[PDB]
Design a protein around this ligand. Structure first.
Ligand code: NI
Length: 341
């Protein structure tokens, strides 16, 4: 049954609630981004209205085969009316098409649902600056102080230099990148750019990237593996056995694989810097895990919430244990006391 933290009170609205069948009294279903835990339930046999971004729209149409009539895309940074309630979609700085949603309730209450996000100081100069937020439904994925990680810019610099070096030393070395969802496209595209290659992928994956309104995308990707020296594979296949297997398949064109696994956080972040990261090697195969996060670090989250100063916070991640809930409420109190709201 639909949990409370996916219901928007004083509306007929839910957010990311597609796996509970028909939710008693919902007139419009919001989808924040195209990730499977969030869209779980949608299919071609869905007949209620779905509100989302243009890009999340292209993906529901073309990947899930939801029918054109039930997909309601909205532009970002624009005041829009939906069943008599003013709403605004903002960029969540998560994966492509990922949005936060502001609800302006008839009674004067104002609600922000972050979906998944990586908080940034640039959000402090959006339409959020213009008025007061009473409730915050918050992505709390890394809501604990141990969770530190570098900026996206730093991680990309590391990857670019690592790849460029290894390929300038051995022109017969292949770079391979893992993927299982949308998001994190920058890793493989920035590596391809430094190497003057296009990225090579399956037909299912090419299709997915065609949905994302990436500028000049036809110039950056391809389904011809042979012409491309950066290859995407399913993340499951990023291990010694899977890569060895894939090296066989290239037909004596390459003698070395360098590979990148974009992890989230990993306990090595408590002891080591980005500059100091080392791969796992076995023969002509090396695999780097790199901490490219599309979620807030603890400090980024804290800063955002302290600037926003909401009256109530309702977490949407790590809600399933009493220990998690309790730990989060302590950090929310600390934040509120340190900042005076
Ligand atoms: Ni997500």
């Amino acid at each position: 049954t639909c949990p409370f933290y996916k219901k928007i009170p004083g509306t007929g609205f839910t957010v990311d609630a597609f796996q509970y069948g028909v939710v008693e009294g919902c007139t419009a279903y919001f989808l924040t981004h195209f990730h499977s835990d969030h869209y779980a339930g949608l299919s071609k046999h869905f007949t209620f209205p779905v509100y989302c971004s243009e890009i999340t729209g292209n993906l529901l149409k073309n990947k899930l085969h939801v029918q054109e009539q039930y997909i309601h895309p909205l532009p970002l940074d624009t005041e829009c009316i939906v069943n008599g309630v003013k709403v605004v979609l903002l960029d969540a700085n998560h994966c492509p098409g990922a949005v936060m949603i502001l609800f302006y309730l008839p009674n004067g209450t104002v609600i922000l649902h972050t979906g998944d996000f990586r908080a940034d100081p640039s959000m402090e100069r959006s339409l959020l600056a213009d008025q007061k937020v009473h409730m915050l439904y918050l992505d709390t994925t890394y809501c604990s102080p141990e969770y530190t990680f570098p900026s996206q810019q730093e991680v990309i610099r590391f990857a670019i230099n690592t790849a460029f070096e290894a390929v300038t030393l051995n022109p017969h070395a292949l770079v391979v990148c893992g993927t299982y969802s949308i998001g994190k496209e920058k890793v493989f595209l920035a590596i391809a750019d430094v190497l003057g290659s296009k990225v090579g992928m399956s037909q299912e994956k090419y299709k997915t990237l065609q949905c994302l309104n990436i500028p000049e995308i036809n110039s950056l990707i391809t389904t011809d593996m042979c012409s491309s020296l950066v290859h995407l594979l399913p993340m499951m296949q990023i291990n010694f056995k899977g890569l060895q297997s894939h090296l066989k398949k290239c037909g004596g064109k390459y003698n070395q694989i360098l590979a990148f696994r974009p992890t989230g956080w990993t306990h090595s972040n408590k002891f080591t810097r980005i500059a100091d990261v080392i791969p796992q090697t076995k023969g002509n195969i090396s695999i780097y895990g790199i901490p490219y996060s599309e979620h807030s670090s603890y400090l980024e989250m804290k800063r955002f919430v302290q600037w926003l100063k909401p009256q109530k916070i309702i977490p949407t991640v790590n809600v399933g244990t009493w220990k998690s809930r309790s730990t989060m409420e302590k950090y929310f109190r600390e934040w509120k006391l340190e900042a005076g709201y």
